[PDB]
Amino acid sequence: AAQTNAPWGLARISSTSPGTSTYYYDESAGQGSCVYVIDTGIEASHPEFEGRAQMVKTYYYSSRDGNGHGTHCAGTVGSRTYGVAKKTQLFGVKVLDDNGSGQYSTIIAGMDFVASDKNNRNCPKGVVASLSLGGGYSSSVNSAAARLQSSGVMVAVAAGNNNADARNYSPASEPSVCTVGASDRYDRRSSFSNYGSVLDIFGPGTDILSTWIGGSTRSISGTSMATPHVAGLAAYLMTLGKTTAASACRYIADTANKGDLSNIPFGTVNLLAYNNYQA
Ligand SMILES: [Ca+2]
Q: Which residues form the Peptidase S8 domain?
């Protein structure tokens, strides 16, 4: 399948080169997989989701995304225009209030929630979780990421927006999950991407067009926008049969486009997520 005049990041993770605007992908498009967006929620009523999104948890007084962040990230995963994995089932978990603030302990509660709940969902092709959030190093936050991953969920986490080595941030520094940095449409590491040997992979994160609340669409920027490209990609690769929840971060690195970003500080991977469909 081909989707012309696509947001640049969907074209990128289907291209070897920058500078084009069609998104090339096998039409399976994540059918039979499940992605949990653990964030401010998801405006499931957005027609871009076509009936495939359900809030399933909150730790606040409403499950609604009253911020828009969770809805944008979720759209990149799996909205019909703006998503990677255009036939995946999306499940929301509201661990952030509406300003974007979550206490750690609640973040943790969300995460163990997914390891349990996946068993209440129909996900024959595989489960993913997408965490576009974080704060300072915590062993506990990190440990809740290793549990979620160990429970057979592909876990994808934002490396962070401080232009700093990510080993000091959580859940990014955790080893066993898939820590995502960011790039721009000219293949520059994004000026705000954390870096450091804990990163596994980079994704489009600067001027990412996606859904917003009210039914609407905006472009914003962050390792948060990069993260759901890798989550959605992993859902896409499960469904096909290329990899598994426990093998997908390795698998994406193995198949990445290798050398191609500017400004990988020394010691940071220079691997860019790629679906290997067109070549
Ligand atoms: Ca890893």
A: 7-279
How remote is the CA of residue 200 from the centroid of ligand 1, in Å?
6
Q: What is the resolution of this structure in A?
A: 1.0
- Tokens, residue 172: 């990014």
Task: Give the Å distance between the CA of 175 and the centre of ligand 1.
Answer: 5
Q: Is residue 39 annotated as a catalytic residue, yes or no?
A: yes
14, 33, 39, 151: the active-site residue:
39
What are the structure tokens assigned to 116, written together? 């349990």
Residue 207 annotated in ligand binding: no
CATH number of 1-279: 3.40.50.200
Crossing angle, helix 104-117 and helix 139-150, to 10 degrees?
A: 10
Q: How many residues does the chain have?
A: 279
For residues 226 and 203, the answer to whether their CB atoms sit within 8 Å is yes
Strand arrangement of the beta sheet that strand 53-58 belongs to: 53-58, 89-94, 33-39, 126-131, 154-158, 178-183, 201-204, 271-272, 257-258
- 200 marked ligand binding residue: yes
Residue 149 corresponds to which amino acid? Q
Query: Catalytic site residue 69?
Result: yes
CA 148, CA 43: separation in Å to the nearest integer? 24
Which long-range contacts link 26-29 to residues 24+ away (Cβ below 8 Å)? 26/1, 26/236, 26/240, 26/277, 27/1, 28/87, 28/236, 28/239, 28/240, 29/1, 29/85, 29/86, 29/87, 29/88, 29/236, 29/239
Q: How far is the CA of 249 from the centre of ligand 1 (A)?
A: 6
Structure solved via: X-ray
